[PDB]
């Protein structure tokens, strides 16, 4: 008698002066909003049920209706921004924060879930949730000696919701809120459950996405080693976010980058640069491009770990977007590397795969490659080996493309082309 009710029947019951009738009707509403597909979220909102639901949240005397309305509001909140807005507009945020203290673990978990959807909408609601004081109660829910004593699903929801409070960049979460949350985050990152680890990595992933001061407060917490370890996980849902975090960290100062190198992250790249999941391969190559954009001694670490042949590998064959990140990694390498290091790169066979990419329909990758060729010749010019390099580029159809790009349209291109042709060739 609470299965597949019509919205009007639900309205009929919730409007009666009978708490039990309202309870059945609320549960019926929750079931519509929980059905496999096409939950009537808009119809429920129009019927003006949100205010009734929000008010039921504050009924301590009847915990069951607190749960049902919490679940209904959770699913409405999981919709579009307009739908989530409807829930917030009803005054659900503070009502939910009060439920976090509930003696019924399943009710506060529902509250944790709803707050998760509200904060997940974006910067504005995220910061509004924080202003209503949700962080302390949430963290208090985790203030226990051993995370393993908490129910599996309850922990997964808390972590996920915390990762949403760390999410979004315009603007980034409040600095003081991040500091509050981090210590707990550092602890969840050492929990054995793969979902908890994934969402913890995602959170760190969001916090490291921004200015170097942001990256600093995370690195300062000493998590780089743990992130490197998770980088070698067998579960793709863990490797993906962990790699994104490590990648973000190396977009910062050289010293922040040295932290990932010291933690031994380079030893996992032979695998990542040939990973089956194209995305993991794209992210990894992009990460490499930022490391080769560092100090000569860091470029040298890339060399010692034998990662150059892997870059040659990616540049030679891979998804186009991955190849583009490879180009960058090369142009950066050649731009800050020593003469001896640029020579090594050539000995690894970079010239041919680099020349072949010039046939690509993408003015950006072409400027990047033409650029690298320049840097390479510049190094050869320092050894009187320019001719020898000309041959190689001439031997593998290289010149037959620079001369081509010489008739290109983009000013930056034909110029760079025209130059290389006269300064080292014809």
């Amino acid at each position: 008698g609470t299965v597949n009710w019509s919205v009007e029947d639900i309205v009929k019951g919730i409007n009666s002066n009978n708490l039990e009738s309202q309870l059945q009707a609320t549960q019926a509403a929750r079931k519509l909003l929980s059905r496999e597909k096409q939950p009537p979220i808009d119809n429920i909102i129009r019927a003006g049920l949100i205010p009734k639901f929000v008010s039921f949240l504050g009924k301590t005397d009847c915990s069951p209706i607190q749960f049902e309305s919490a679940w209904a509001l959770t699913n409405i909140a999981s919709g579009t921004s307009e739908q989530t807005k409807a829930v917030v507009d009803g005054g659900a945020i503070p009502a939910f924060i009060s439920l976090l203290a509930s003696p019924h673990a399943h009710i506060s978990e529902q509250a944790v879930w709803a707050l998760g959807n509200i904060a997940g909408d974006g910067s504005a609601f995220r910061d509004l949730v924080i202003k209503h004081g949700a962080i302390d109660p949430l963290l208090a829910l985790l203030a226990v000696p051993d995370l393993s004593t908490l129910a599996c699903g309850y922990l997964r929801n808390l972590t996920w919701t915390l990762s949403n409070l760390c999410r979004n960049k315009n603007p980034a979460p409040p600095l003081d809120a991040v500091e509050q949350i981090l210590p707990t985050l550092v602890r969840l990152l050492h929990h054995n459950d793969p979902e908890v680890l994934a969402d913890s990595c995602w959170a760190i992933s969001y916090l490291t996405d921004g200015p170097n001061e942001r990256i600093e407060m995370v690195v300062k917490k000493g998590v780089v080693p743990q992130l490197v370890k998770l980088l070698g996980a067998t579960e793709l849902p863990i490797v993906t976010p962990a790699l994104r975090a490590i990648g973000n960290i190396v977009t910062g100062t050289d010293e922040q980058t040295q932290k990932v190198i010291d933690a031994g992250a380079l030893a996992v790249f032979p695998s990542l640069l040939t990973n089956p999941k194209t995305n993991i391969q794209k992210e990894a190559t992009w990460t490499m491009s930022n490391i080769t954009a560092g100090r000569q001694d860091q470029i040298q670490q890339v060399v010692n770990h034998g990662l150059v042949p892997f870059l040659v590998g990616v540049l030679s064959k891979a998804d186009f977007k991955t190849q583009k990140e490879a180009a960058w990694a090369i142009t950066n390498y050649t731009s800050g590397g020593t003469v001896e290091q640029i020579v090594y790169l050539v000995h690894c066979g970079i010239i041919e795969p680099l020349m072949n990419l010039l046939s690509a329909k993408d003015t950006k990758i072409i400027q990047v490659i033409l650029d690298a060729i320049s840097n390479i010749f510049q190094a050869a010019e320092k050894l009187g080996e320019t001719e020898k390099l000309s041959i190689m580029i001439e031997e593998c159809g290289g010149l037959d493309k620079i001369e081509a790009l010489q008739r290109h349209e983009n000013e930056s291109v034909y110029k760079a082309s025209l130059n290389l042709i006269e300064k080292y060739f014809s």
Binding site: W71, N75, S205, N290, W328
Partner: peptide
């Protein structure tokens, strides 16, 4: 400016919201 920050952020991003089935 050697370092290149994030683009489209495409490990995509975990679903921002979850419906309780």
């Amino acid at each position: 400016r050697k370092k290149r920050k994030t683009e489209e952020e495409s490990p995509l991003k975990d679903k921002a919201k979850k419906s309780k089935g």
